Design a protein around this motif. Structure first.
Motif, PDB file in Angstrom:
ATOM      1  N   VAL D  50      47.212  34.569  71.459  1.00  0.00           N
ATOM      2  CA  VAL D  50      46.814  34.562  72.923  1.00  0.00           C
ATOM      3  C   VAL D  50      46.606  33.671  73.119  1.00  0.00           C
ATOM      4  CG1 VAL D  50      46.535  35.582  75.243  1.00  0.00           C
ATOM      5  CG2 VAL D  50      48.458  36.594  72.591  1.00  0.00           C
ATOM      6  N   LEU D  51      44.311  33.578  72.506  1.00  0.00           N
ATOM      7  CA  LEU D  51      43.475  32.746  73.404  1.00  0.00           C
ATOM      8  C   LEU D  51      43.081  31.969  72.704  1.00  0.00           C
ATOM      9  CD1 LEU D  51      41.338  35.088  75.807  1.00  0.00           C
ATOM     10  CD2 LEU D  51      43.517  33.851  76.546  1.00  0.00           C
ATOM     11  N   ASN D  52      43.887  31.654  71.031  1.00  0.00           N
ATOM     12  CA  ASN D  52      43.477  31.104  70.341  1.00  0.00           C
ATOM     13  C   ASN D  52      44.456  30.890  69.328  1.00  0.00           C
ATOM     14  OD1 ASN D  52      41.134  29.483  69.044  1.00  0.00           O
ATOM     15  ND2 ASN D  52      40.682  30.570  67.135  1.00  0.00           N
ATOM     16  N   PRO D  53      45.748  30.151  70.002  1.00  0.00           N
ATOM     17  CA  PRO D  53      46.937  29.498  69.508  1.00  0.00           C
ATOM     18  C   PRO D  53      46.055  28.215  68.491  1.00  0.00           C
ATOM     19  CG  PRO D  53      46.384  28.651  71.710  1.00  0.00           C
ATOM     20  CD  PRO D  53      45.778  29.937  71.227  1.00  0.00           C
ATOM     21  N   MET D  54      47.786  27.019  68.257  1.00  0.00           N
ATOM     22  CA  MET D  54      47.490  26.526  66.807  1.00  0.00           C
ATOM     23  C   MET D  54      46.782  24.909  68.364  1.00  0.00           C
ATOM     24  SD  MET D  54      51.440  25.645  66.150  1.00  0.00           S
ATOM     25  CE  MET D  54      51.945  26.849  65.821  1.00  0.00           C
ATOM     26  N   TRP D  55      46.818  24.919  68.677  1.00  0.00           N
ATOM     27  CA  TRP D  55      46.892  23.646  69.249  1.00  0.00           C
ATOM     28  C   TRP D  55      45.298  24.109  70.261  1.00  0.00           C
ATOM     29  CZ3 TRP D  55      45.192  24.605  74.644  1.00  0.00           C
ATOM     30  CH2 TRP D  55      45.977  25.873  75.288  1.00  0.00           C
ATOM     31  N   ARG D  56      44.435  25.278  70.380  1.00  0.00           N
ATOM     32  CA  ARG D  56      43.297  24.701  70.946  1.00  0.00           C
ATOM     33  C   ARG D  56      41.991  24.577  69.336  1.00  0.00           C
ATOM     34  NH1 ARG D  56      40.546  25.133  75.155  1.00  0.00           N
ATOM     35  NH2 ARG D  56      38.948  26.450  73.895  1.00  0.00           N
ATOM     36  N   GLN D  57      42.884  24.560  68.014  1.00  0.00           N
ATOM     37  CA  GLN D  57      42.363  24.257  67.049  1.00  0.00           C
ATOM     38  C   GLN D  57      42.459  23.181  66.182  1.00  0.00           C
ATOM     39  OE1 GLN D  57      42.495  27.845  64.442  1.00  0.00           O
ATOM     40  NE2 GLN D  57      43.888  29.169  66.197  1.00  0.00           N
ATOM     41  N   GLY D  58      43.402  21.647  67.001  1.00  0.00           N
ATOM     42  CA  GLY D  58      42.929  20.905  66.334  1.00  0.00           C
ATOM     43  C   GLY D  58      43.903  21.047  65.619  1.00  0.00           C
ATOM     44  N   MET D  59      45.434  21.171  64.935  1.00  0.00           N
ATOM     45  CA  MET D  59      45.856  21.717  64.828  1.00  0.00           C
ATOM     46  C   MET D  59      46.871  20.817  65.481  1.00  0.00           C
ATOM     47  SD  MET D  59      44.922  24.055  62.603  1.00  0.00           S
ATOM     48  CE  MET D  59      43.216  24.037  62.431  1.00  0.00           C
ATOM     49  N   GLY D 448      47.661  15.661  73.736  1.00  0.00           N
ATOM     50  CA  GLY D 448      46.861  14.080  73.803  1.00  0.00           C
ATOM     51  C   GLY D 448      47.164  13.125  72.610  1.00  0.00           C
ATOM     52  N   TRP D 449      46.266  13.762  71.453  1.00  0.00           N
ATOM     53  CA  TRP D 449      46.007  13.191  69.960  1.00  0.00           C
ATOM     54  C   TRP D 449      47.336  12.806  70.149  1.00  0.00           C
ATOM     55  CZ3 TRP D 449      41.947  10.925  69.985  1.00  0.00           C
ATOM     56  CH2 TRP D 449      40.833  11.427  70.153  1.00  0.00           C
ATOM     57  N   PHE D 450      48.264  13.037  69.472  1.00  0.00           N
ATOM     58  CA  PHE D 450      50.126  12.621  69.919  1.00  0.00           C
ATOM     59  C   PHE D 450      49.995  11.403  70.444  1.00  0.00           C
ATOM     60  CE2 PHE D 450      53.737  12.420  67.405  1.00  0.00           C
ATOM     61  CZ  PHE D 450      54.572  12.272  67.814  1.00  0.00           C
TER      62      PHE D 450
ATOM     63  N   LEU G 279      43.214   5.060  78.172  1.00  0.00           N
ATOM     64  CA  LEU G 279      42.574   5.453  79.851  1.00  0.00           C
ATOM     65  C   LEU G 279      44.349   6.011  80.068  1.00  0.00           C
ATOM     66  CD1 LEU G 279      40.478   2.954  80.952  1.00  0.00           C
ATOM     67  CD2 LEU G 279      39.955   4.648  79.382  1.00  0.00           C
ATOM     68  N   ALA G 280      44.555   6.075  80.142  1.00  0.00           N
ATOM     69  CA  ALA G 280      46.399   6.098  80.606  1.00  0.00           C
ATOM     70  C   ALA G 280      46.484   8.006  80.198  1.00  0.00           C
ATOM     71  CB  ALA G 280      47.280   5.698  79.609  1.00  0.00           C
ATOM     72  N   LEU G 281      45.898   8.375  79.390  1.00  0.00           N
ATOM     73  CA  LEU G 281      45.179   9.877  79.302  1.00  0.00           C
ATOM     74  C   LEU G 281      44.188  10.456  79.986  1.00  0.00           C
ATOM     75  CD1 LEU G 281      47.341  10.071  76.007  1.00  0.00           C
ATOM     76  CD2 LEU G 281      48.449   9.903  77.732  1.00  0.00           C
ATOM     77  N   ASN G 282      43.401   9.702  80.029  1.00  0.00           N
ATOM     78  CA  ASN G 282      42.309   9.940  80.765  1.00  0.00           C
ATOM     79  C   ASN G 282      41.145   9.399  79.411  1.00  0.00           C
ATOM     80  OD1 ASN G 282      42.516   9.681  83.290  1.00  0.00           O
ATOM     81  ND2 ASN G 282      42.480  11.912  83.250  1.00  0.00           N
ATOM     82  N   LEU G 283      42.093   9.325  78.175  1.00  0.00           N
ATOM     83  CA  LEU G 283      40.854   9.083  76.641  1.00  0.00           C
ATOM     84  C   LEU G 283      39.887   8.316  76.679  1.00  0.00           C
ATOM     85  CD1 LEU G 283      43.510  10.106  74.054  1.00  0.00           C
ATOM     86  CD2 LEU G 283      41.721  11.126  74.377  1.00  0.00           C
ATOM     87  N   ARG G 284      39.164   8.370  77.480  1.00  0.00           N
ATOM     88  CA  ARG G 284      38.191   6.935  78.489  1.00  0.00           C
ATOM     89  C   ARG G 284      36.990   7.291  77.218  1.00  0.00           C
ATOM     90  NH1 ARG G 284      37.842  11.310  83.370  1.00  0.00           N
ATOM     91  NH2 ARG G 284      39.950   9.805  84.731  1.00  0.00           N
ATOM     92  N   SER G 285      36.346   6.142  76.655  1.00  0.00           N
ATOM     93  CA  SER G 285      34.557   6.329  76.177  1.00  0.00           C
ATOM     94  C   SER G 285      33.917   6.748  77.596  1.00  0.00           C
ATOM     95  CB  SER G 285      34.665   4.945  75.165  1.00  0.00           C
ATOM     96  OG  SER G 285      35.523   4.175  74.664  1.00  0.00           O
TER      97      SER G 285
END
Ligand code: CLA
Ligand code: CLA
Ligand code: CLA
Ligand code: CLA
Ligand SMILES: CCCCCCCCCCCCCCCCCC(=O)OC[C@H](CO[C@@H]1O[C@H](CO)[C@H](O)[C@H](O)[C@H]1O)OC(=O)CCCCCCCCCCCCCCCCC
Ligand SMILES: CCCCCCCCCCCCCCCCCC(=O)OC[C@H](CO[C@@H]1O[C@H](CO)[C@H](O)[C@H](O)[C@H]1O)OC(=O)CCCCCCCCCCCCCCCCC
Ligand SMILES: CCCCCCCCCCCCCCCC(=O)OC[C@H](COP(=O)(O)OC[C@@H](O)CO)OC(=O)CCCCCCCCCCCCCCC
Ligand SMILES: CCCCCCCCCCCCCCCC(=O)OC[C@H](COP(=O)(O)OC[C@@H](O)CO)OC(=O)CCCCCCCCCCCCCCC
Ligand SMILES: CC1=C(/C=C/C(C)=C/C=C/C(C)=C/C=C/C=C(C)/C=C/C=C(C)/C=C/C2=C(C)CCCC2(C)C)C(C)(C)CCC1
Ligand SMILES: CC1=C(/C=C/C(C)=C/C=C/C(C)=C/C=C/C=C(C)/C=C/C=C(C)/C=C/C2=C(C)CCCC2(C)C)C(C)(C)CCC1
Ligand SMILES: CCCCCCCCCCCCO[C@@H]1O[C@H](CO)[C@@H](O[C@H]2O[C@H](CO)[C@@H](O)[C@H](O)[C@H]2O)[C@H](O)[C@H]1O
Ligand SMILES: CCCCCCCS[C@@H]1O[C@H](CO)[C@@H](O)[C@H](O)[C@H]1O
Ligand SMILES: CCCCCCCS[C@@H]1O[C@H](CO)[C@@H](O)[C@H](O)[C@H]1O
Ligand code: OEX
Ligand SMILES: [Ca+2]
Ligand SMILES: [Cl-]
Ligand SMILES: [Cl-]
Ligand SMILES: [Fe+2]
Ligand SMILES: [Mg+2]
Lengths: 32, 38, 39, 503, 172, 63, 342, 36, 30, 34, 79, 33
Positions: D50-59, D448-450, G279-285
């Motif tokens: 609920v409040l600590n799913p995988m996407w909060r943990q950098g998985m 975001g990272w993907f 920056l498109a994602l606000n992934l800024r320095s």
């Protein structure tokens, strides 16, 4: 009527340019 | 059911085909008239 | 006639240039009068 | 000798060693997948979806296993919060083990093909030169790709022989793996309809089988063979790189905007859900329905699931991060513990005031409160000497409904101001900031990272396509132009048609 | 300042106090360095495009040139024939001396103007000011992109050196 | 070169290197499929973009 | 009887004043519409309904302040086709809604594709290696990342650059205030490539021009060169000695020199494109976490880095209400961050 | 049997200096962000 | 440790300048 | 200063791995027959 | 090939043609503005058409799919 | 476990520095005539 690519290219640019410059000239005398 | 945007899609499609069709017909026509000599 | 050089190129360049000067001058005048003048 | 950036060209005319190199690359990638999954299992906390799913943990790889039906651990937990489940072998750990073993087997096959590179298979029977019939190879591989694609859709995704895929309600509250039937109407092209994913793999798979058979049985036109240089393996590298950067842009787009294949319980919410106040609207709709049925305010807000409130919080917005703010979201605002409840702000007159929320664009944002009509009624001033809307002048209080603080009211201005500063982030939560030594600075999610990695790689691969496409079409001049390049071909007036000696 | 972030501080304050972006000498500067970079890439690519074949497929083509050789290492007629068809024939340099003079002149002149921008805004002759230049028939200000620049400049102005000003005008 | 049991089995699949069909062959048909593919991509792009909006196709998490 | 495709290929590749080619079928319409759209919009078209801004000569703007502005934020990332569901075929409404922005961006993108294809096509016809096309991938990476990817990561086309001089300046300042873009190492590599490219351009041109052999009697030396000549027109040996003694190192390989001139600005622009994708994602320095921890605990600790964040905070607060009108920001005077007196 | 596709590899001194400069300057640039 | 790291990389760069100038591959006319 | 603890190893490997790659290639170039 | 531009623009024939067409284009562009038609083709406010007499709010478009009707409504409010 | 923060860099350089020394020497031996 014998046109060339160069003639066509020249006028697609030149004809609007002169028309636009007449328009911008007229705009200089518009008052609010 | 053809929504307005589907009608718009068809208008865009036919419009694009016309531009391309006329472009190539003209280019082909010119190229047949004005052939290179070998 | 289509013969080139009947009208000397230096006169063409001078007249065209003066035309450019006139039209650009008109645009700078418009910066101080009517729309865009801040007045 | 070869310069450093050309060392791998020794494989161009050596099919056996090219296969060996491709085997080694495949072993490395499968080993990464296995290693990555093991590291995540060693760090993943499964105790609170609920409040600590995988996407909060950098998985990063955990959501991809779950997407296709691997949701359980041999240690008894499931990612939907169940206890005492038997996943069989195909747990997260089993998947990781399978990839490590695959990596090793591929490594061994690479060794064999590297040593025994001179297989009769790779020689042209006529010329005795190394030769790959790339047009027919394409047909064979396309046929195989079609079969795998079809079977994936018809058996795995349908649940007919397989687990199905992750599906959820529109607010990401009740996700689970389910069998999914194909959608054969126009809603199959809706990116948020999972049945379209099933129909795609069935239909595109059948098409790939048919086109594969075509490319197995019909030779390329001489016009296309010559123009695309189908005898040159580097032509395949050019167009393959193009296909791959097209795919990379697509998966970056569907990750950022969301689709049936990027669900919010696996990758986190999207930035656009914050932009459009998607979760706030659903929360308010439920609250008003509770009130309309006779609930008290405390009851209406207490009926809101913590999970729903947590989506309505900017620390879960993937557009709030930073390029070098590394690690899990928990490293920033902390490990979420509990909803504090909904804060309702009022002035001394008793009018309800609403804190203006922070847009994703702003690293920092002022505290401004308006009435229901958008009229400013209070704020936290910067300059004090001409303040008119301070919480002290306006007597601003805050009452909480639902959550930890349910039924409580605060009137001490510094305390009221502190809660107001949290309210610009949406719903207010209590965080454990000690366990990870969190720094209080927002980070982005796997969503975001993907997106970042795949948009960047996609753009870089555009250069690769251009480069190898040039190398293919200009192979004859790779080392320079003709020593005696006839000036008549590069000067004007000599030839009628450019680059045609016959004109 | 003699540092990387200190340079950015100098630039931002400069924009607040001189609207340097709207100054034509800084604009010539940008044209100088953008144009210098473009022509650098251009010249580099055109000469590289026309290297005469002197090496095999496995050697770097750079070994095709020997330091101090008398012959030119590329075919400038080939390069010109390419570039003249990319734009039009007369838009290209066939004279290597004119070409290399242009490569010198364009960035040098533009950066001269950049330097003169800073050196004349040093005496507070600043970038163009079109703040509230467009007015409707009643007299309402109709904002332009210049007014948006002004709003950003104001944010820089009011925040910089936040403890140093006692009086309402920043006169230096 | 080295013959193997599997290599002999696979031999015909790698035996027609360089073989072509005469002239333009199936290029016109290919061009048709390419055109159909382009329109298909345009359709799914415009559905996702909400430039093309179809009855019963709600492009949202709510469908 | 050769077929129509070959007849057409012949005509397309005729040597004429302006080469056409197959690539010209894509290049010339799209480039012309992109340029014509910009001139039309900056001459005649407003930004009142999308931005609350005047933006044309007709309204009283000048060359520095005219623009073709992005559509309203409420349009999202709509393609905004003239026949689309927003303008519904109405050309006037289409202009008022910002359709010319996507018109220019999309025709410009395909025009740039056509131009790079032209570079390939001409290179192949005259027989040179296509490094010029390869170098052009840097402008394309910049255009695609800045005008397409960046707004696609944000809420809408509204936050893409608008096509105008002052509009582009606003884009620079927005990126400083909101993204701290100057702090970004990918922008820094971009700066290095552009300034290094300009440096290489100047220094190479000056070096050639000042190591020329005397190949004529004129005091003006330009006429003493013949394009067909075999000999170098300047002394590589003398240039190498001069720079070795002045700077410590010098080029000695003319081929490496000119490849390096391609490499430096092209790589710089590619690196800047990567930062903008972030920056498109606000992934800024945006920040250095160690700096913020120290400054938050120690009110006497100050660096140029913390000074610039205060500038950024001023930019955001003072520009956002008029720059983002769809947000309906009302910032009472008392909340605006300000130093003393100013 | 020996593989006929092998080739020697080379990196001359100037390339070594150019590469070390690239690596060291990149490290000098990115290290601040690694420390953060 | 950060300061040491920054100064170390800087020092390596200055050392590289020294070798690149005085221990360069000498330009030779052939 | 509370810097990221992995900053040191990251910078060290960033320098050493590619530098060592180049040194390997250079030295084995010098040692080839002349 | 084609005649050099310097031959064309120094010929009498070129200037007989273009002493008519160039001024005509210029005057047409002038009239396009001076009659006010440019305002109505492109939907650009005249100086008295940015605001109604007492309204203080810019007519920003806020609705993607009825923005067309939204502008139409904003224009009828000028009265 | 609260391990020494310098343990990682110490172990990494302890492996890498002498290992790369040996690889450098091996490779330039192989490349000799
Ligand atoms: C019953 C039949 C059926 C159904 C219901 C589907 C259903 C689907 N198809 Mg499939 N397909 C089918 C049959 C079917 N397909 C057949 C027979 C083929 C031929 C083999 C295909 C080939 C195909 C392809 C190639 C694609 C689909 C995709 C999809 C998905 C579209 C929704 C989406 O998210 O697109 C999102 C994708 C788009 C909206 C397309 C974007 C096109 C870009 C913009 C073009 C330019 C790209 C270029 C690199 C430029 C980048 C510039 C940028 C940097 C700015 C949906 C699952 C798409 C997908 O996989 O989505 C995940 C997709 O790309 N299908
Ligand atoms: C597609 C690639 C990808 C993506 C999207 C992710 C995503 C994620 N990873 Mg994973 N990872 C990956 C590949 C990926 N990973 C690989 C290949 C490895 C093995 C190294 C790992 C090992 C790993 C570990 C050990 C951890 C993660 C963690 C995470 C999470 C936080 C990431 C973070 O802080 O990055 C921060 C991003 C950066 C600092 C950006 C780096 C920018 C580089 C240095 C630019 C270089 C520029 C270059 C030198 C210039 C050349 C110029 C020249 C050409 C001229 C996030 C969900 C963390 C987590 O929370 O796990 C639970 C975590 O602890 N990942
Ligand atoms: C399927 C993808 C793919 C494949 C199989 C190839 C294959 C090849 N490339 Mg191409 N290329 C690609 C994509 C690809 N490339 C992309 C995406 C780009 C833009 C980045 C390029 C740009 C490019 C250029 C400019 C050149 C090549 C060249 C070559 C040839 C020699 C390669 C070599 O010896 O490098 C040896 C590489 C090293 C010794 C070290 C490279 C270290 C890199 C910079 C950092 C480390 C990467 C890391 C280990 C793994 C990241 C993987 C993942 C994140 C993607 C070989 C045919 C060369 C060629 O054409 O020769 C004739 C050449 O000059 N490629
Ligand atoms: C080659 C030159 C070229 C290119 C690439 C473009 C490209 C574009 N134009 Mg521009 N345009 C051009 C020339 C070009 N244009 C010319 C000469 C004019 C003046 C007439 C215009 C005037 C113009 C306007 C007024 C607008 C555009 C717009 C657009 C964009 C949307 C176009 C679209 O959706 O068409 C869709 C149509 C096609 C893609 C044609 C499809 C043809 C296929 C291949 C036929 C194959 C059929 C197949 C075999 C069978 C399928 C049958 C099917 C029924 C199942 C796109 C970027 C729009 C825009 O920019 O919005 C912001 C817009 O409003 N263009
Ligand atoms: C054969 C081809 C023929 C030529 C084809 C040309 C195609 C390309 C066209 C390029 C257009 C360049 C900008 C036009 C400027 C313009 O019209 O301003 C028109 C404006 C009009 O002036 C404005 O008019 C308004 C009327 O309402 C108000 O009066 C304003 O106050 C007033 O400033 O003129 C100016 O701004 C004065 C300075 C103009 C100088 C521009 C120099 C640009 C140099 C850089 C060019 C690109 C690099
Ligand atoms: C030999 C092989 C190479 C050896 C490694 C070389 C040195 C590494 C250089 C990279 C270091 C980057 C991170 C440094 C900071 C750090 O400590 O990270 C540390 C982070 C981990 O983050 C940590 O997580 C912890 C909890 O698990 C804590 O929260 C820590 O506080 C946190 O630092 O490492 C990573 O996340 C690495 C994964 C990177 C994924 C990036 C995806 C996108 C990349 C695209 C780049 C392409 C563009 C370039 C094109 C040109
Ligand atoms: C502007 C010119 C300055 C740019 C300098 C760039 C670096 C030197 C680059 C360099 O060495 O240039 C060399 C170049 C050629 O030199 P020449 O010896 O042929 O001519 C210069 C004198 O000797 C007079 O003939 O000089 C010029 O072309 C002068 C142009 C003046 C044109 C009219 C004056 C305009 C002012
Ligand atoms: O320099 C001097 C040169 C003088 O030419 P001439 O008077 O000798 O006559 C033209 C030919 O004889 C040139 O060899 O000027 C030009 O020819 C070009 C000037 C106008 C060029 C206008 C061309 C039409 C526009 C084409 C733009 C697109 C081409 C690039 C593709 C994107
Ligand atoms: C042999 C064998 C075996 C074993 C196996 C194994 C154990 C394996 C392992 C494997 C592994 C364990 C692998 C791993 C891999 C990894 C990788 C491959 C990684 C990579 C990475 C990368 C590439 C990265 C990059 C980067 C960085 C570093 C930073 C940031 C950016 C990026 C992301 C770019 C067995 C028993 C089965 C049996 C059979 C035989
Ligand atoms: C958009 C669109 C379109 C198109 C259109 C077009 C194509 C147009 C064109 C137009 C044009 C094409 C225009 C032009 C104009 C021009 C101008 C306006 C110019 C001006 C100039 C000037 C002003 C100059 C200046 C100068 C300079 C720059 C430098 C030095 C000298 C001087 C100073 C003189 C269509 C219909 C398709 C469709 C719808 C949309
Ligand atoms: C953590 C850092 C790790 C980085 C690891 C770096 C990997 C570097 C691998 C480089 C491999 C070099 O590969 C090396 O190539 C040279 C030629 O160049 C070969 O040398 C071969 O060619 C030369 C010249 O024709 C002959 O003198 C020699 O007798 C012959 O065997 C070597 O047999 C091989 O060992
Ligand atoms: C200390 C001021 C009076 C109480 C204000 C509480 C606001 S909420 C507070 O905010 C912190 C930052 O998110 C969290 O770490 C913590 O979990 C939470 O209790
Ligand atoms: C523009 C799409 C390109 C598709 C090319 C298909 C060519 S089709 C091909 O064309 C020849 C004429 O050149 C004819 O001789 C031949 O009979 C015809 O089949
Ligand atoms: O010192 Mn540095 O900055 Ca030239 O303005 Mn005044 O002073 Mn200060 O304020 Mn703004
Ligand atoms: Ca702490
Ligand atoms: Cl300051
Ligand atoms: Cl003062
Ligand atoms: Fe040069
Ligand atoms: Mg005026």
């Amino acid at each position: 009527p014998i046109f060339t690519v160069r003639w066509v290219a020249v006028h697609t640019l030149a004809v609007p340019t002169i028309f636009f410059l007449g328009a911008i000239a007229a705009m200089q005398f518009i008052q609010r | 059911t053809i929504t307005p945007s589907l009608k718009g899609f068809f208008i865009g499609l036919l419009s694009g085909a016309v531009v391309l069709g006329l472009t190539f017909a003209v280019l082909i026509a010119i190229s047949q008239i004005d052939k290179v000599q070998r | 006639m289509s013969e080139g050089g009947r009208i000397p190129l230096w006169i063409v360049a001078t007249v065209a240039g003066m035309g450019v000067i006139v039209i650009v001058g008109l645009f700078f005048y418009g910066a101080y009068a009517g729309l865009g003048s801040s007045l | 000798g070869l310069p450093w950036y050309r060392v791998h060209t020794v494989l161009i005319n050596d099919p056996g060693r090219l296969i060996a190199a491709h085997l080694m690359h495949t072993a490395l990638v499968a080993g990464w997948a296995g290693s990555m999954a093991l590291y995540e299992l060693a760090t993943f906390d499964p105790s609170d979806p609920v409040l600590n799913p995988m996407w909060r943990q950098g998985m990063f790889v955990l959501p991809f296993m779950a997407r296709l039906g691997v949701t359980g651990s041999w240690s008894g937990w499931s990612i939907t919060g169940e206890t005492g489940i038997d996943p069989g072998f195909w747990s997260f750990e089993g998947v990781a083990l399978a990839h490590i073993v695959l990596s090793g087997l591929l490594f061994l096959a690479a060794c064999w093909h590297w040593v025994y590179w001179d297989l009769e298979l790779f020689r042209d029977p006529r010329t005795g030169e190394p030769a790959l019939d790339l047009p027919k190879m394409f047909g064979i591989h396309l046929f195989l790709a079609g079969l795998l694609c079809f079977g994936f859709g018809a058996f795995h995704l349908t649940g007919l022989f397989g687990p199905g895929m992750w599906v959820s309600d529109p607010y990401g509250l009740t996700g689970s793996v389910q069998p999914v039937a194909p959608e054969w109407g126009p809603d199959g092209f809706n990116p948020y309809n999972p049945g379209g994913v099933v129909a795609h793999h069935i239909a595109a798979g059948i098409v790939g089988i048919i086109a594969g058979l075509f490319h197995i049985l019909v030779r390329p036109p001489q016009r296309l063979y010559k123009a695309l240089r189908m005898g040159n393996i580097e032509t395949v590298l050019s167009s393959s790189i193009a296909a791959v950067f097209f795919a990379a842009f697509v998966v970056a787009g569907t990750m950022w905007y969301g689709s049936a294949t990027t669900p919010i319980e696996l990758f986190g919410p999207t930035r656009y859900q914050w932009d459009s106040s998607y979760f706030q609207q659903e929360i308010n709709r439920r609250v008003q329905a509770s009130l309309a049925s006779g609930a008290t305010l405390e009851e209406a807000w207490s009926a809101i699931p913590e999970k729903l409130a947590f989506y309505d919080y900017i620390g879960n917005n993937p557009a709030k991060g930073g390029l070098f703010r590394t690690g899990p979201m928990n490293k920033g605002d902390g490990i979420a513990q509990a909803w504090k409840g909904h804060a309702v702000f009022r002035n001394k007159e008793g009018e309800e005031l609403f804190v203006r929320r922070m847009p994703a664009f702003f690293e920092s944002f002022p505290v401004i409160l308006t009435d229901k009509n958008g009229v400013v009624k209070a704020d936290i001033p910067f300059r004090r000497a001409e303040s008119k809307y301070s919480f002290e002048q306006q007597g601003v209080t805050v009452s909480f409904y639902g959550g930890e603080l349910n039924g409580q009211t605060f009137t001490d201005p510094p305390t009221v101001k502190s809660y107001a500063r949290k309210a610009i982030f949406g719903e207010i939560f209590e965080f454990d900031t000690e366990t990870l030594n969190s720094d209080g600075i927002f980070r982005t999610s796997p969503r975001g990272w993907f997106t970042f990695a795949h948009a960047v790689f996609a753009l870089l691969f555009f250069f690769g396509h251009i480069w190898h496409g040039a190398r293919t079409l200009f192979r004859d001049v790779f080392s320079g132009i003709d020593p005696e390049l006839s000036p008549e071909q590069v000067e004007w007036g000599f030839y009628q048609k450019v680059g045609d000696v016959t004109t | 300042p003699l540092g990387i972030s200190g340079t950015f501080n100098f630039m931002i304050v400069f924009q607040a106090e001189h609207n340097i972006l709207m100054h034509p000498f800084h604009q010539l500067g940008v044209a100088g360095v953008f144009g210098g970079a473009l022509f650098c890439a251009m010249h580099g690519s055109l000469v590289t495009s026309s290297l005469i074949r002197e090496t095999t497929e496995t050697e770097s083509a750079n070994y095709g040139y020997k330091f101090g050789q008398e012959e030119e290492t590329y075919n400038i007629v080939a390069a010109h024939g390419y570039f003249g068809r990319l734009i039009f024939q007369y838009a290209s340099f066939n004279n290597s001396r004119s070409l290399h003079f242009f490569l010198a002149a364009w960035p040098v002149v533009g950066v001269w103007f950049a330097a003169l921008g800073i050196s004349t805004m040093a005496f507070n002759l600043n970038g163009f000011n079109f703040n509230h230049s467009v007015i409707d028939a009643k007299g309402n200000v109709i904002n332009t992109w210049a007014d948006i620049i002004n709003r950003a400049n104001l944010g820089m102005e009011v925040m910089h050196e936040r403890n140093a000003h006692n009086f309402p005008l920043d006169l230096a | 070169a080295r013959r193997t049991w599997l290599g002999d089995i696979l031999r015909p699949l790698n035996s027609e290197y360089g073989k072509v069909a005469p002239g333009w062959g199936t290029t016109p048909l290919m061009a048709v499929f390419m055109g159909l593919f382009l329109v298909f991509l345009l359709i799914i792009l415009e559905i996702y973009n909400s430039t093309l909006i179809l009855d019963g196709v709600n492009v949202s998490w709510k469908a | 009887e050769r077929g129509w495709f070959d007849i057409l290929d012949d005509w397309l590749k005729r040597d004429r004043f302006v080469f056409v080619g197959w690539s010209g079928i894509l290049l010339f319409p799209c480039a012309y519409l992109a340029l014509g759209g910009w001139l039309t919009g900056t001459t005649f078209v407003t930004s009142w309904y999308t931005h609350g801004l005047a933006s044309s000569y007709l309204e009283g703007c000048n060359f520095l302040t005219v623009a073709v502005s992005t559509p309203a934020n409420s349009m999202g990332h709509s393609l905004l086709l003239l026949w689309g569901p927003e303008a519904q075929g109405d050309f006037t409404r289409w202009c008022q809604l910002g359709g010319l922005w996507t018109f220019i961006a999309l025709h410009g993108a395909f025009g740039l594709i056509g131009f790079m294809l032209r570079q390939f096509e001409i290179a192949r016809l005259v027989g040179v290696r296509p490094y010029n096309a390869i170098a052009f991938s840097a402008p394309i990476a910049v255009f695609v990342s800045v005008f397409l990817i960046y707004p696609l990561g944000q809420s809408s086309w509204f936050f893409a650059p608008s096509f105008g001089v002052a509009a582009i300046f606003r884009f620079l300042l927005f990126f400083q205030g909101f993204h701290n873009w100057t702090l970004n190492p990918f922008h820094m590599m971009g700066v290095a490539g552009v300034l290094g490219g300009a440096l290489l351009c100047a220094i190479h041109g000056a070096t050639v021009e000042n190591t020329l052999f005397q190949d004529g009697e004129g005091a003006s030396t330009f006429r003493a060169f013949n394009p067909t000549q075999a000999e170098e027109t300047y002394s590589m040996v003398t240039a190498n000695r001069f720079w070795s003694q002045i700077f410590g190192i010098a080029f000695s390989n003319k081929r490496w020199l000119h490849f390096f001139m391609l490499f430096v600005p092209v790589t710089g622009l590619w690196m800047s494109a990567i930062g903008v994708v972030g920056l498109a994602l606000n992934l800024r320095s945006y920040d250095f976490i160690s700096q913020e921890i120290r400054a938050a605990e120690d009110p006497e600790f100050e660096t140029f880095y913390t000074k610039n964040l205060l500038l950024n905070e001023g930019i955001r607060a003072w520009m956002a209400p008029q720059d983002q009108p769809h947000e309906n920001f009302v910032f009472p005077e008392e909340v605006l961050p300000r130093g003393n007196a100013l | 049997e020996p593989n006929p596709n092998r080739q020697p590899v080379e990196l001359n001194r100037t390339s070594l200096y150019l590469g070390l400069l690239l690596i060291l300057v990149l490290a000098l640039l990115f290290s601040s962000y690694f420390f953060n | 440790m950060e300061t040491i790291t920054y100064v170390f990389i800087f020092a390596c760069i200055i050392a590289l300048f020294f070798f690149a100038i005085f221990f360069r591959e000498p330009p030779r006319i052939t | 200063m509370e810097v990221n603890q992995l900053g040191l190893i990251a910078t060290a490997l960033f320098v050493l791995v590619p530098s060592v790659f180049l040194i390997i290639l250079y030295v084995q170039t010098e040692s080839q027959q002349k | 090939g084609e005649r050099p531009f310097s031959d064309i623009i120094t010929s009498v024939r070129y200037w007989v043609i273009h002493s008519i067409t160039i001024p005509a284009l210029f005057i047409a562009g002038w009239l396009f503005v001076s009659t006010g038609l440019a305002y109505d083709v492109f939907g650009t406010p005249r100086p008295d058409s940015y605001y109604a007499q007492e309204q203080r709010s810019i007519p920003l478009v806020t609705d993607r799919f009825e923005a067309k009707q939204q502008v139409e409504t904003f224009l009828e409010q000028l009265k």
